[model samples]
Target: STTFAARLNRLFDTVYPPGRGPHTSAEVIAALKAEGITMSAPYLSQLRSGNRTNPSGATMAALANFFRIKAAYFTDDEYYEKLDKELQWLCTMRDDGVRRIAQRAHGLPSAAQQKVLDRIDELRRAEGID
Candidate 1:
């Protein structure tokens, strides 16, 4: 959608449903308000409508707190795009390299270590590690 609000709402609806409990925007907002956030109903609507494109850091923090999601969710498009690319790359591994990947994937528990392990494993397994 062209509207910021619509896009924002789409993100929320895709992740949260209309329920009175966890995983619902209403519940998330109530939790935020309970935690001393001064979110007005109209302001919330405006945010959903993209009327408020740039939220203050405090507002973003409050929302992230209530939703239990990363504050970056509100303002980090480049980060997410990078993450998406990385995930796509991981998913492209061929079956022959599976065991080698497992060994390296469990090494050091970081992206750099994993990449090194994956590449080495792919090469050793005679698959598309390159």
Candidate 2:
């Protein structure tokens, strides 16, 4: 998680949603360009490939802005851990089944919601899948 490449790939995976994959390097360059940030595809590829990790602060800020995440994510482990749950939820909420299940349980009363929530744990445990 602390590695720049992993952090970069995490945003690509969760920020863009699954299956379709992340945006091309060119698209990202175009986006940053529109944001008044000048970034080359070669530099971006270098970062993504872990060849170039220590970007300048301004460059790091540009990347954080592009992904709409806090700049500290690239440096602070505690901050990254805190945000990881929500970032992971971004991946989870992309699933059609998960969305439908939440939709079905959307307006349930607390008691009914708890029942479904409880059963979910049991189902997972019985299958021994985390």
Encode model 1's per-residue lDDT on 29-113: one tens digit a residue.
6877676766777788778866678677887767656645566655677644554354345344433466576665574658787
Root-mean-square deviation of Cα positions for candidate 2 versus the true structure, in angstroms: 2.7
Q: Against the hidden reference, what TM-scores do the models get? A: 0.47, 0.82
Clashes of 2: 0
Candidate 2 ranges with C-alpha deviation above 4 Å: 17-21
Tens digits of per-residue lDDT for model 2, 2-80: 7988887788767863477666667788988887888989999989999998888888788777778989988899988
- Residue pairs that clash (backbone atoms under 3 angstroms), model 2: none
Number of the top-ranking candidate, with TM-score as the measure: 2
